[PDB]
C-alpha cells in the first residue's frame, strides 16, 4: 500500500557467426588439374617399360 | 541475320570480387554486354568447380 511505492517496480535468436578468426582471399589458381594426368600418364610410362624388359627377355 | 565480324558466341567471367564464409559463398561478376549485341538472361548460368 505505502513506503516502497513511491518508487516503482524466449525461444531462438540464430547468431551465425561465433568466435573463429578472420579470412583472407586471392586469385592465382588451379594448375593442380594437369598433375592428376601428368601422375597417371608416367604410372603408365612405367608399366610400359616393364613390359619392354619382358618382351626383349622373351626374345 | 549474322554478322561479318568477328565476335565471340560464349564468354567466360571469372569474379571481380568473392567472398567464402562459414556456411555460404559469394561472388560478384562484371556482366559486360558489350556493344551491337543482345544477351538472353536465359543463357547464362554459373559454372561451380570444387
Redesign the interface.
Known sequence: AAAAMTATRMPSSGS???V?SS?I?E?KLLALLAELEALSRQLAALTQQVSELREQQQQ | VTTDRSQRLTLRFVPVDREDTTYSYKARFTLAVGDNRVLDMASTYFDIRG
Open positions: 551465425s557467426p561465433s573463429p579470412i582471399a586469385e
